[PDB]
Design an enzyme around this catalytic site. Structure first.
Site, PDB file in Angstrom:
ATOM      1  N   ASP A 152       4.881 -75.974   9.401  1.00  0.00           N
ATOM      2  CA  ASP A 152       6.268 -76.457   9.165  1.00  0.00           C
ATOM      3  C   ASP A 152       6.537 -77.669  10.292  1.00  0.00           C
ATOM      4  O   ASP A 152       6.605 -77.266  11.470  1.00  0.00           O
ATOM      5  CB  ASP A 152       7.541 -75.603   9.194  1.00  0.00           C
ATOM      6  CG  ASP A 152       8.790 -76.214   8.731  1.00  0.00           C
ATOM      7  OD1 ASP A 152       8.909 -76.594   7.382  1.00  0.00           O
ATOM      8  OD2 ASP A 152       9.744 -76.270   9.609  1.00  0.00           O
ATOM      9  N   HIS A 225       4.466 -82.445  -2.349  1.00  0.00           N
ATOM     10  CA  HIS A 225       5.722 -82.485  -1.571  1.00  0.00           C
ATOM     11  C   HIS A 225       5.469 -83.661  -0.538  1.00  0.00           C
ATOM     12  O   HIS A 225       6.350 -84.409  -0.420  1.00  0.00           O
ATOM     13  CB  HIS A 225       5.744 -80.964  -0.942  1.00  0.00           C
ATOM     14  CG  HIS A 225       6.913 -81.123  -0.078  1.00  0.00           C
ATOM     15  ND1 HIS A 225       8.345 -81.551  -0.552  1.00  0.00           N
ATOM     16  CD2 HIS A 225       7.140 -80.704   1.019  1.00  0.00           C
ATOM     17  CE1 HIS A 225       9.137 -81.395   0.532  1.00  0.00           C
ATOM     18  NE2 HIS A 225       8.491 -80.788   1.688  1.00  0.00           N
TER      19      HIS A 225
END
Ligand code: HEM
Length: 311
Positions: A152, A225
């Site tokens: 992340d 994404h």
């Protein structure tokens, strides 16, 4: 621009996280305003005290005010240029809801005791004039991976780029060193996600899982994404600071990601969000948004103006 006059908008997502959205009671504007003004002072005092007590625990706080809250509390006053009400996004395959809310807190530390204490001390001032919209408790997963198992924040701007993209500069001088923060809580369909192969998950994301090397564009799905979530208008690669956070009740099998994105420009976040939901980001097949609102994050000095009743 001075990042030392910003709240904690630009760096550390933290090992233990608390997300709190509150609404104002709308029963007595005077008394409710008076308590927000106290809170603008007390919240900084609370951080000072805990930073004295626990200087090695990386206490980080960002507190925010929504467009609706601003109009109600500060009707006679200037307003940050890009501060507006988010009411959701109408997408292609999927929609996103808007959630009415007035105040936001994002509290991060090396220990849950410090996130507890910040909120418990703030709520002494704010509980008589508010109700809770959402309260979510989050954590850092292994190696800072999102709960889906991919790292992340790799393409987040860092150091000077984080200042450039994170906080308001000379374009809005009244509110310089402030930020716009968008909170969006997602539930994941972990069972479906876990049944994909590693390679199938890598297609959804646009990067390799274990090494986190970006895929060559030749090999990416165009709905991946990390393709659709970009804002590349005018051949500029616009950024925000994403500090996304796993949350889970793993006994009950209720698991998700709470998105939190801090930007100099709300316009950039809103464009990334519109791209995702109109172009059908593959990650949205395993991710259902259940709330969302945007908040202005005042600078230190804007908090001081609020506390002194100037707005
Ligand atoms: C369930 C929610 C979400 C999850 C699990 C998620 C996960 C990820 C992952 C794993 C990456 C790749 C690593 C990286 O470069 O940071 C990434 C990148 C990114 N995400 Fe998300 N994300 C979510 C929601 C959002 C939302 C709501 C936005 C925008 C409003 C967004 C914007 C981005 C951007 C701009 C990138 C960087 C792409 C690049 O430049 O390569 N994400 N996200």
């Amino acid at each position: 621009v001075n990042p030392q006059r910003s709240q904690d908008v630009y760096r550390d997502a933290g090992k233990n996280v608390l997300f709190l959205m509150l609404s104002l009671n709308r029963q007595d504007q005077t008394n409710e305003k008076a308590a927000v003004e106290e809170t603008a002072d007390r919240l900084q005092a609370i951080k000072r005290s805990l930073n004295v007590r626990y200087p090695d625990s990386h206490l980080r706080i960002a507190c925010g005010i929504s467009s609706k809250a601003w109009d109600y509390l500060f009707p006679q006053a200037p307003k940050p240029k890009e501060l507006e009400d988010f009411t959701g996004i109408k997408g292609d395959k999927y929609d996103a809801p808007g959630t009415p809310a007035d105040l936001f807190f994002h509290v991060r530390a090396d220990d849950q005791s410090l996130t507890y204490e910040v909120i418990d001390e703030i709520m002494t001032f704010l509980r008589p004039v508010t109700k809770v919209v959402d309260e979510t408790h989050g954590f850092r997963y292994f190696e800072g991976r999102a709960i889906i198992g991919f790292v992340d924040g790799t393409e987040n701007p860092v150091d000077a780029d984080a200042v450039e993209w994170g906080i308001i500069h000379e374009e809005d001088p009244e509110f310089e060193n402030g930020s716009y923060a968008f909170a969006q809580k997602y539930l994941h369909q972990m069972d479906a996600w876990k049944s994909l192969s590693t390679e199938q998950q890598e297609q959804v994301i646009g990067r390799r899982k274990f090494t986190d090397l970006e895929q060559g564009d030749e090999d990416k799905n165009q709905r991946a994404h990390n393709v659709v979530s970009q804002d590349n208008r005018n051949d500029v690669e616009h950024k925000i600071i994403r500090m996304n956070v796993p949350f889970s009740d793993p006994g009950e099998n209720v698991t998700g990601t709470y998105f939190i994105g801090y930007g100099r420009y709300w316009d950039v976040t809103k464009t990334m969000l519109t791209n995702m939901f109109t172009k059908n980001d593959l990650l949205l097949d395993y991710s259902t948004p259940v709330n969302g609102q945007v908040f202005f994050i005042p600078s230190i000095d804007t908090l001081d103006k609020i506390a002194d009743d100037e707005y």
